[PDB]
Amino acid sequence: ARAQHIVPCTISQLLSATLVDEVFRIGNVEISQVTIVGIIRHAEKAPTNIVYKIDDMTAAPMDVRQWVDNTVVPPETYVKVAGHLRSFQNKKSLVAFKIMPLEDMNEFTTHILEVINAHMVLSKANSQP
Amino acid sequence: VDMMDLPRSRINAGMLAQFIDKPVCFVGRLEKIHPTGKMFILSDGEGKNGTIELMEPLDEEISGIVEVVGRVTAKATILCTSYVQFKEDSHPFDLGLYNEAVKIIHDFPQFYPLGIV
């Protein structure tokens, strides 16, 4: 035991994930660490953290929380986020360990492809039942 | 509304007729801006045009690859509620490849869900 992937996801997948045996699952794919790509719609600056509303078109924007001790990433910027999926008080959010503005927008197209291929192949590996 | 809180389908121009009155996200290259500034044309990764309408005139020039969020109108144009120009100052955006992504999204909805499922 046991391999742990950073699974590329859409927000619609994160919002739909349900806790099964204490771990989040979308379809039969387990997710804990994930990546998303979307556009910053809002940035909420506090002294200990920044909370971004990040939008990938697939659902309403998701809350993404980043720990402070780089400045706030400006709104209307595409970013790749890597983070841990949380649901505190039945409200889904990401806790980001990486937030990187995109300089090459082909990375955004590649993420779409990666989401679909990762979920296709991980679901097949897990099924089985 | 403020489709920023709704699921928006990523489409190309050949899909416009099938998405009438639906929230959409259209990526394409800026072909031209109407004299009024309240309409522009984007060509998709198959080289097909979509007409983008605005309620207010543009407050800036746009060019290159532009991504529009809006609702498909009765006339299969898009009433745009927001847009982002894609930065290409170091790397040209492959719109043909994006178009393939769009076809894949629509062929595999189980792996790229629209909205909560």
UniProtKB/Swiss-Prot annotation, chain A:
It is found in: Nucleus; Nucleus, PML body. Induction: Translationally up-regulated in response to DNA damage (at protein level). Differentially phosphorylated throughout the cell cycle, becoming phosphorylated at the G1-S transition and dephosphorylated in late mitosis. Dephosphorylation may require the serine/threonine-protein phosphatase 4. DNA damage-induced 'Lys-63'-linked polyubiquitination by PRPF19 mediates ATRIP recruitment to the RPA complex at sites of DNA damage and activation of ATR. Ubiquitinated by RFWD3 at stalled replication forks in response to DNA damage: ubiquitination by RFWD3 does not lead to degradation by the proteasome and promotes removal of the RPA complex from stalled replication forks, promoting homologous recombination. Residues 34-101 bind DNA. It comes from the Eukaryota. Belongs to the replication factor A protein 2 family. Component of the replication protein A complex (RPA/RP-A), a heterotrimeric complex composed of RPA1, RPA2 and RPA3. Interacts with PRPF19; the PRP19-CDC5L complex is recruited to the sites of DNA repair where it ubiquitinates the replication protein A complex (RPA). Interacts with SERTAD3. Interacts with TIPIN. Interacts with TIMELESS. Interacts with PPP4R2; the interaction is direct, DNA damage-dependent and mediates the recruitment of the PP4 catalytic subunit PPP4C. Interacts (hyperphosphorylated) with RAD51. As part of the heterotrimeric replication protein A complex (RPA/RP-A), binds and stabilizes single-stranded DNA intermediates that form during DNA replication or upon DNA stress. It prevents their reannealing and in parallel, recruits and activates different proteins and complexes involved in DNA metabolism. Thereby, it plays an essential role both in DNA replication and the cellular response to DNA damage. In the cellular response to DNA damage, the RPA complex controls DNA repair and DNA damage checkpoint activation. This is Replication protein A 32 kDa subunit. It comes from Homo sapiens (Human). The chain holds residues 41 to 176 of 270 of the full protein.
From Swiss-Prot, chain B:
Ubiquitinated by RFWD3 at stalled replication forks in response to DNA damage: ubiquitination by RFWD3 does not lead to degradation by the proteasome and promotes removal of the RPA complex from stalled replication forks, promoting homologous recombination. It comes from the Eukaryota. It is found in: Nucleus. Keywords: Acetylation, DNA damage, DNA recombination, DNA repair, DNA replication, Isopeptide bond, Nucleus, Ubl conjugation. One of its GO terms (biological process) is mismatch repair. One of its GO terms (molecular function) is single-stranded DNA binding. Gene3D superfamilies: Nucleic acid-binding proteins. GO terms for cellular component: DNA replication factor A complex; nucleoplasm; site of double-strand break. Pfam families: Rep_fac-A_3 (PF08661). The modification N-acetylvaline is found at V1. There is a cross-link at K22, K38, K87 (Glycyl lysine isopeptide (Lys-Gly) (interchain with G-Cter in ubiquitin)). Belongs to the replication factor A protein 3 family. Component of the canonical replication protein A complex (RPA), a heterotrimer composed of RPA1, RPA2 and RPA3. Also a component of the aRPA, the alternative replication protein A complex, a trimeric complex similar to the replication protein A complex/RPA but where RPA1 and RPA3 are associated with RPA4 instead of RPA2. Interacts with BRIP1/FANCJ via the RPA1 subunit; following DNA damage they colocalize in foci in the nucleus. As part of the heterotrimeric replication protein A complex (RPA/RP-A), binds and stabilizes single-stranded DNA intermediates that form during DNA replication or upon DNA stress. It prevents their reannealing and in parallel, recruits and activates different proteins and complexes involved in DNA metabolism. Thereby, it plays an essential role both in DNA replication and the cellular response to DNA damage. In the cellular response to DNA damage, the RPA complex controls DNA repair and DNA damage checkpoint activation. This is Replication protein A 14 kDa subunit. It comes from Homo sapiens. The lineage of its organism: Eukaryota, Metazoa, Chordata, Craniata, Vertebrata. The gene is RPA3.
